[PDB]
Structure formats: C-alpha cells, structure tokens
C-alpha cells in the first residue's frame, strides 16, 4: 500500500510524511465555508489486491495556524461528517485495487466571529491529516502523515 499526490510527491510502502499545498478561496465571510477537498490531490492503492485487503482510516485531523485560531470546522471522510479537529479515529475505507483511488477527505472551515483581515497566510501550515493503514494479512500498521499548507492568503472581510 502506498500513496501519492497529484503532480506532487509520494509516501512509500510503510508510511511516512509529505507536504500538500491547497488553493483556498481568497475571501470568505462569516457564515460561509472554505471547502478543502483533498480527494482530488491524495491517492492511494493496494499492492496485492488479489490476496490482501487494505483498510484505511482518518486517524486524526488537526488544525494549525490561522485555521486553528480563526476557523471552526468539520471534516468529511467517505460520506460521514465529523468535528475538525477530530475527536476519534474514523471507521475504515477498503482499498482493494492497484489502481489509484482518492483518499476521500474534505475540510469544511468557517470563520469564527473574531476573524478579520488576513485569517490564513499564504504558505502557512493549516492542518495535519493522518491516514492510518492496516490489512487482513499481517501486522502492518502504518501512518501516512499529510501536512497541509495554504497556497494563498484568505481574507475575512470586516
């Protein structure tokens, strides 16, 4: 099992970490959502799908920087919604093909009432999403740590 990002980088068999940059709506009002859909950027596959089933969870989602201080949010994983930052490891998604399949994670972030001005700075760390992968064959239990960075400033009008 391993993962890659679109025109990006890879995390090899056995896990590891990578940095992922996201484009954000440059202006978001209180009451609106910034939707950060990682399913178009992070893809994973099963290396032995004929004999082994891989199981993949969102182990944890954490907020950093301007997202931690200026937004409230939720994360959607494979059709289910959760608080972000997360409070538990999600149920598992099965990976059963060598064909790259999206990791179905999206953040829905909305400004808190105190946000104003530049609420997320370009280039800054905004989140960490930890993917945990196991299987039905051996003791493999690996973390794929995705450090999420903003491409651009996000302004909350005042």
Q: Which two tokens stand for residue 64?
A: 């950093």
- Comparison of 43 and 84: residue with beta carbon closer to Ni ion: 43
Of 128, 134, 133, residue with least CA distance to 148: 128
The listed partner (Ni ion, its own copies, none) that binds 17, CB under 5 to 8 Å by sort, is: its own copies
* Binding positions for Ni ion, rule: CB under 5 A: 47
Residue 139 binds its own copies, judged by CB under 8 A: no
Of 34, 33, 2, 38, residue with least CA distance to 20: 38
Please answer whether residues 56 and 18 qualify as being in contact, where contact means their C-beta atoms are separated by less than 8 angstroms: no
- Comparison of 4 and 92: residue with beta carbon closer to Ni ion: 4
The residue whose two tokens read 């930890």 is 130
At a CB cut-off of 8 Å and minimum separation 6, what does 44 contact? 1, 2, 3, 4, 56, 95, 100, 101, 103, 131, 133, 144
Residue 78 binds its own copies, judged by CB under 8 A: no
The 47-66 contact track toward its own copies, x by CB under 8 A, reads: ------------xx------
Min dist. Cβ of residue 155 to its own copies (A): 19
Chain breaks in the chain (C to N over 2.5 A) after: none
Q: Which residue is nearest to Ni ion (CB)?
A: 47
- Comparison of 83 and 116: residue with beta carbon closer to its own copies: 83
Binding-site ranges for its own copies (CB under 8 A): 14-17, 19, 30-31, 59-60, 72, 74, 79-83, 87-89, 110, 125, 128, 130, 132, 141-145, 147
């Amino acid at each position: 099992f391993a993962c890659k990002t679109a025109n990006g980088t890879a995390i090899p068999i056995g896990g590891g970490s990578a940095n992922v940059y996201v484009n954000l709506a440059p202006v978001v009002n209180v009451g609106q959502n910034l939707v950060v859909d990682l399913s178009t950027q992070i893809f994973c596959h099963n290396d032995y799908p004929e004999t082994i089933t891989d199981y993949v969870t969102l182990q944890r989602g954490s907020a950093y920087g301007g997202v931690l201080s200026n937004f409230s949010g939720t994360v959607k994983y494979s059709g289910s919604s959760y608080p972000f930052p997360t409070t538990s490891e999600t149920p598992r998604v099965v990976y059963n093909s060598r064909t790259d399949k999206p990791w179905p994670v999206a953040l829905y972030l909305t400004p808190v009432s105190s946000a104003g001005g530049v609420a997320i700075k370009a280039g800054s760390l905004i989140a960490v999403l930890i993917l945990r992968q196991t299987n039905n064959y051996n003791s493999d239990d690996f973390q794929f740590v995705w450090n999420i960075y903003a491409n651009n400033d996000v302004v909350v009008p005042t």
